[PDB]
Amino acid sequence: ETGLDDITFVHVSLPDLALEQVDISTKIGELSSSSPIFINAMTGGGGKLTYEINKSLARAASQAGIPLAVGSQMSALKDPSERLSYEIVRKENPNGLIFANLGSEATAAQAKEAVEMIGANALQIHLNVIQEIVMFSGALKRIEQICSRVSVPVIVKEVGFGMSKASAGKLYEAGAAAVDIGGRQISFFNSWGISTAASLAEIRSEFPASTMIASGGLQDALDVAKAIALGASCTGMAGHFLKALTDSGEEGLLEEIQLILEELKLIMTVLGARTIADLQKAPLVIKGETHHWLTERGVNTSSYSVR
Amino acid sequence: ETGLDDITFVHVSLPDLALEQVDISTKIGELSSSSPIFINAMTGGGGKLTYEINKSLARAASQAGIPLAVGSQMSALKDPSERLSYEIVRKENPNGLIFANLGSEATAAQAKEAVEMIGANALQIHLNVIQEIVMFSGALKRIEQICSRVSVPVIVKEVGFGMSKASAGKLYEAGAAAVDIGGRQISFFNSWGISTAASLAEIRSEFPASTMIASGGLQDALDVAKAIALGASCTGMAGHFLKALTDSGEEGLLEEIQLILEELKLIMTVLGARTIADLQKAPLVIKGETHHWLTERGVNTSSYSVR
Amino acid sequence: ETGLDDITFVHVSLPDLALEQVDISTKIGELSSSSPIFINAMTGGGGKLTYEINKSLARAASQAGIPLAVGSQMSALKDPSERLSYEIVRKENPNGLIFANLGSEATAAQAKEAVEMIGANALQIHLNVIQEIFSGALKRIEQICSRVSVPVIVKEVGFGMSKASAGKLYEAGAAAVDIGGRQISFFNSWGISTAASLAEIRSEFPASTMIASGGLQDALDVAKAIALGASCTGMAGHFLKALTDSGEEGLLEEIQLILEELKLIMTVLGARTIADLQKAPLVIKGETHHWLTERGVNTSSYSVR
Amino acid sequence: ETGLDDITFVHVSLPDLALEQVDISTKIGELSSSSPIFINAMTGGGGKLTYEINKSLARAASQAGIPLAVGSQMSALKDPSERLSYEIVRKENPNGLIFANLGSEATAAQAKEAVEMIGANALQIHLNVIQEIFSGALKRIEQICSRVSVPVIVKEVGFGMSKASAGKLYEAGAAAVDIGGRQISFFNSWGISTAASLAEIRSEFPASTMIASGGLQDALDVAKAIALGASCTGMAGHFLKALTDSGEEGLLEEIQLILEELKLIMTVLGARTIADLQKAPLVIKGETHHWLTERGVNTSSYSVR
Amino acid sequence: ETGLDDITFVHVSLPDLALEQVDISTKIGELSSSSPIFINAMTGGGGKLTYEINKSLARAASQAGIPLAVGSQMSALKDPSERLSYEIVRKENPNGLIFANLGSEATAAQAKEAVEMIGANALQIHLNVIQEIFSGALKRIEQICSRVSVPVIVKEVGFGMSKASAGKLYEAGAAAVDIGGRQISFFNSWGISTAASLAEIRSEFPASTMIASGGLQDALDVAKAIALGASCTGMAGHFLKALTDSGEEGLLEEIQLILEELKLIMTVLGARTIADLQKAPLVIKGETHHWLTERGVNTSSYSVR
Amino acid sequence: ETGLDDITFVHVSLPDLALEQVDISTKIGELSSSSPIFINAMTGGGGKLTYEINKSLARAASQAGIPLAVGSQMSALKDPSERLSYEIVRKENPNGLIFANLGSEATAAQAKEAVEMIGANALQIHLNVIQEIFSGALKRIEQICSRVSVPVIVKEVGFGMSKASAGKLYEAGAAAVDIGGRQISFFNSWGISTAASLAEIRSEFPASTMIASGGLQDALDVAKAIALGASCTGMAGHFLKALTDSGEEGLLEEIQLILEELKLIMTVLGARTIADLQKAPLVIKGETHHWLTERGVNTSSYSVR
Ligand SMILES: Cc1cc2nc3c(=O)[nH]c(=O)nc-3n(C[C@H](O)[C@H](O)[C@H](O)COP(=O)(O)O)c2cc1C
């Protein structure tokens, strides 16, 4: 439940645009991407299978010209053996944006080694206190240390429970180039968190010019569009691509990518949005739970409509 | 329906806390308690069984270091025989906080005798007009007389229908050290009352520094947390503990107590709340019926979110 | 669900009976009882709390005239202090029926020793090889029945009992059977309902003694269990609660209240005795009906009789 | 629920009949009636309000040609003033069928006296040993039938009636049976539906007179009751309401409206007479079907006939 | 609901057939048709709009090879101008099958005259004594069949038809029967479903011609109707709509689309001919199953064949 | 839905067995297998990703002792590079059972060549004439069985299989059948459930080998399929997922986990062998029950045995 169904674009009768004029390029921090959609690979079970799955993703990605994030490289950090499974990603995709990945427990050292491992353009640090607690002092400290010692932009990612404007503000201040929103005691967290939608609207209100990313739960192109309209500069997808891979291999995956990138252009065309920056100012109406949450949190919702 | 499901904590991505730093001690008036959870014993059927059930509760309590409230001592007041069933509680738990119990019909005399009976640290006076009417002049008068003649703090308890800021204000003014929120004509009261949640938020708005207690309906540790976040200094539980007792005796009960006290620490850890006073300022969002009720009643709801 | 909701008594317009002429006495195996209902004590958590709960259950029971079954005695078999928590049952109820209790793992020696501890009038052996996941179980039950003189009631817990299993227990020497009907997911719809078991077992052993315990919500459930073939019914949770909410005086009231409510239902049915209620015309529907039909158990006999 | 919704008439494409050729006259026991429907007065709360309601029901009834059954007369049997509230029924309706009314506790003397009070053409005796919670009931009914010359209709209230009970009442001498199908919780799903009773009783006594009252919502319900075996149907609440909302003229209209609507359904069915509607092909489904099946009552005969 | 959803074909793993070998030709009574489906024109509102709709339906029909049934001709029988709205049907479709149409009130003279108006190959007589609320109906149908040389198809509208009614129409001389299955409330659950009728009528008259019209949503519904016994199926609303949304070219497409979709279902079933599809193994469930069972119609023959 | 939810095992109170005495070995046709469960590889999208997935499935399989079926080989039959993606299966699993795979269109030469490619112990031929919309199919299957020496398992996909189709495949020489049960709308409720097929086919061919694949959610589903008659069960999606989420070590664990969970269910049932689990008393209800009943398949034998 990303809360994106609480967002409805305001219809444009005269979009005055041709699909061919639609520009979907975007900027993740200072990095330039020709796609507002990137692939979030899964760690997997390791071995030679993970290697082939990653190689395929990298090829597909390289061809579609869209970014690619690898799974956690922590294990490959201690086991020189498993390291090949990630280096193959940079070998297959030499000119594409690729993001490294490590948990918030990582040290500035490991972060550098992970980035160097695949020649990353950015480094993703994922947080997950609620999950690590069931199965946390120093997290922010560690992130702050990593940010000032890596040669690339850092993207702090929250897996599942969303992020507040306070959390985002701390990461930003600490040095994070961006944030990636993914929003017998497990019951305690059944209705816990902030929705992807609410998160974006919240963080956007306090930091208008700050890079936001949304990933997880984005079922289709309309989802991507809503997230980007709420402020996201880029969106990420995993499962969707993973399965298309195991069904039709590289050939299939590539198709699915192109298909959704074209389906986004279609939505932008119907909205009169010529570029991603235009899609970020598209009039829309927030309703339901999201609208309630934002209202109580002090976030203005009508500004999304009257703009 | 405590209305606590209308409360959702605002997620904290970087709680920056270790379970070991969590301090769950609290203050019920001037009384200090190492636990924000106390046991509300049930009167029972009397006899020697009630005696053993109370003795066990007292032992369990004494060991877990959490307060214990006995059932109404009114009957034991007129029958010198049944008195032993309560005195055993102080014998077994000599160093723990124990609250005496009497109905609002009690006199300053009986109140003193009840308190003296078990050497109570506080005295609970329960109100229940709607129940006593189906199966009330002077109630406040009697409470006011009891408060100025007992040597301990008085806790006025409402069983089931909640309490308004007006009701709380009168009891406070009368001398009550705290209030315990428990929110063929019976149909008249099917949808009658104020929810535990709404009550706390209401009373808290008019009396910020006044001791509030919440009991009844608190199914788990998250409930306790929400109540304490709404302003409660302490929460009470009965059924939950009563049954664990009859299932595994003292040994079992003790476990269940420790289990829920540790599960609360876990929630506080995920929230970044180092202490109970911190849990009382935890950003949260009120929705649904509770939010409506409070809005109409003039209580500010966004203050719980933006704080 | 016990399946008893699938049982509807055929209404009687002219019962021709007065509540005073109703006899609720029954017969568990060779044992006689003035009540078709009995308390099913719960082991609890040892300590003096059990001692007192047991003592109270024993007193009430004694005064009510209904038999009492104690919780498992495996612990008292080893601990002296705990043993007193059971001996008290007989000390307070010297003339009433009392059933001793042990698991199907118990040895004949243990069975005998448990019986002597409380001067039991019958012994309950509970099964549930399902939770214990073995071999010998049946043979161990057989010895127990041979070793003890008093009737042995083998109690199944929650999953029901088929005519085949009942028959095996009977051949082993059991005086009666007590019907209570990541891997745990496999047994979500596993079993035979209380109703289906009573009807099934009764079809193969019309004279054998059956008991129904667990789930029985009220007098009417008791009435149906007996109508379906049970000679006695057991109840725990209801009584336990009545004890912790009103003490002995409470329990004694609830025990009487339910016995009088049973006599009422029998009056409305024209059943003067427990043997009559066992021949009361009724109609079986829904799942129960299908199960019994596929299993070859006649269902119209309950209606045409 | 009467269970009549479980009855669906087999459609007739070529009825070959005109509304004018339809005969709705029937026969209650030895009594003849030009209507298969009759008013079922309600005792009310005595006083002059009953006197007037009765008088109105009597007038309407008289003008409509349909029989009228008065509420219980037990009070008039003792009070002179109240007695006039019933005598008026015959005073205003001197040539119509009228049924007297008493409880199953009534004595033969009372029965006879109630009949003479209004010059009754039949006597209703209502049962409900269920609410009275006895012995003798049946024997008391027997005497009543023997003591009174007019036919006695034993009316069951709400819980239905089995073939066994009906048979007992018939042996007792009843001319017909009127089917109306903290402890109160025991009887929430207790009983036999109106439909199930008619079908059951009819299976054992094909010539005996049965009546269906209570629940009948409209003409179609009347049609089904008769089709299932009833010789007459009773209605109260509907008429009572029609009286307090439009007076006599209203009641008289509603009475005619429903009688003409019955003739219509019969026309669409090709049933020229009441004896034909009683052999009308129909299909029994749902609960009714199961009940009858388990009770050994044939259901296909209603369809293949 | 037609009840066809209660019919599920038994799947065939190895049909052993090519869409090219499938033959959908059938036989309505003595009439031959290259299509098991036909258009059921709608009288409409006279005027030149009917003339044009009819003309279009006739053209499409003609080109598609499927028979066309015109709406009621009772008005043209009296009005010259309107008459042209039907004569045009034959003028535009000189070699195709066309059915004339009249109500069951029509007289043999009218029937004959309606047939001559369009040079009909068969005549439809629609029933619905239900809405007309008489006597003679059947006898009038008989004369009509005798007076006209072409086959007469008696069409029931919405309430279904029982084996008894069908049998009467057959004895009267009907070549086939067309199954279409404040007082209005009485007929809310009145009738026999299309499926139940076909199965019932077929059980008594295995060789007689039956038609199913109304409700058929698509090719699969057509497949089931035939499987259940129908020799032809009728469709209106679907075609009418196709005409007002795409004109003749549209209708002609929809007509072909559905015929090819039928051949597909037959291919998947291994039914090469219409006579094969009529012996296709299927399973009857739900209401239909019960109805047929209670009515004594065998249901397993549809499955074991 | 597989229909397996309509199957409930009859509970056994005294199984008399230890998990150690349970034997899950079975027999597919003439082939012997130490496991009643096998992996059902998925063709995927060629390339080195298939080569690796296959290699991993082969390794796991090999270590687990369970047979492996490869995806379609039609592509490898023509492409050399792809061929290696299958040859590797045997290279990594030299002593385990492996099934080759081809469509029902394949020619005997292709069948033989596919078998030699991986040194197959059996060959699977999948059907689905439904999606291919022909003639010869059966005759082509026959030749394939004759041309290849190893047993041929004809696999139906999603729509089930009737006793008739199974019988045809058996006469053709198939060693076993693998049950997997704008126009697309026609087949929304088309087919026979996995359960219904196994029961149906078993009724006509008590000794013939059947396999159940697809839908099986867990060990209990496996238990039921076998109980209903299957000699082996297939699983894909579950294993595939386990591979992409934990690699070989994961798959090997899930394979063992499910095999031990099967042995548990058998222990609770008292079934020591696979041949015993095939005679385990069970009750069939709902749709399955009706289908089998109408199709003339006995359902009580599953319960009374
Ligand atoms: C097997 C598995 C492995 C994953 N590994 C990683 C990881 O290494 N790093 C990370 O940041 N997220 C990881 N994720 C989370 C996903 O990237 C993402 O947050 C979401 O759960 C799945 O994306 P989707 O909703 O687009 O399918 C994993 C998810 C699964 C199911």
Ligand SMILES: Cc1cc2nc3c(=O)[nH]c(=O)nc-3n(C[C@H](O)[C@H](O)[C@H](O)COP(=O)(O)O)c2cc1C
């Ligand atoms: C049998 C019984 C006896 C009780 N006796 C008392 C009492 O003496 N004094 C009191 O203040 N509340 C009494 N209560 C109320 C509980 O303390 C509390 O308000 C609530 O109903 C039960 O707590 P829970 O929701 O945590 O189980 C009693 C409740 C029950 C069921």
Ligand SMILES: Cc1cc2nc3c(=O)[nH]c(=O)nc-3n(C[C@H](O)[C@H](O)[C@H](O)COP(=O)(O)O)c2cc1C
């Ligand atoms: C706390 C507790 C302890 C129990 N102990 C035993 C026991 O020692 N032996 C036994 O045969 N049944 C035992 N039972 C089962 C009950 O006697 C009975 O069969 C049923 O599961 C629960 O009560 P009911 O009959 O009111 O539903 C226990 C039940 C509970 C709740």
Ligand SMILES: Cc1cc2nc3c(=O)[nH]c(=O)nc-3n(C[C@H](O)[C@H](O)[C@H](O)COP(=O)(O)O)c2cc1C
């Ligand atoms: C106010 C009132 C009084 C009634 N009094 C009698 C009575 O004296 N005797 C009797 O046999 N039935 C009596 N009935 C029952 C009705 O005649 C009838 O059987 C049924 O319960 C209610 O009307 P219905 O047939 O329209 O459903 C009474 C019903 C009502 C509502």
Ligand SMILES: Cc1cc2nc3c(=O)[nH]c(=O)nc-3n(C[C@H](O)[C@H](O)[C@H](O)COP(=O)(O)O)c2cc1C
């Ligand atoms: C506007 C309209 C006029 C119709 N006129 C006739 C008619 O004259 N004669 C007749 O036998 N059926 C007539 N029908 C019935 C249809 O031919 C058919 O049996 C069915 O009720 C409606 O179409 P369907 O088969 O597509 O459901 C008419 C239906 C409609 C909607």
Ligand SMILES: Cc1cc2nc3c(=O)[nH]c(=O)nc-3n(C[C@H](O)[C@H](O)[C@H](O)COP(=O)(O)O)c2cc1C
């Ligand atoms: C990606 C994919 C490829 C498959 N390829 C084949 C194949 O080549 N041959 C075959 O007989 N079945 C094939 N299947 C069917 C499966 O083996 C199996 O019968 C079922 O449809 C899906 O797995 P399940 O058994 O876990 O439900 C395939 C299924 C999937 C998802």
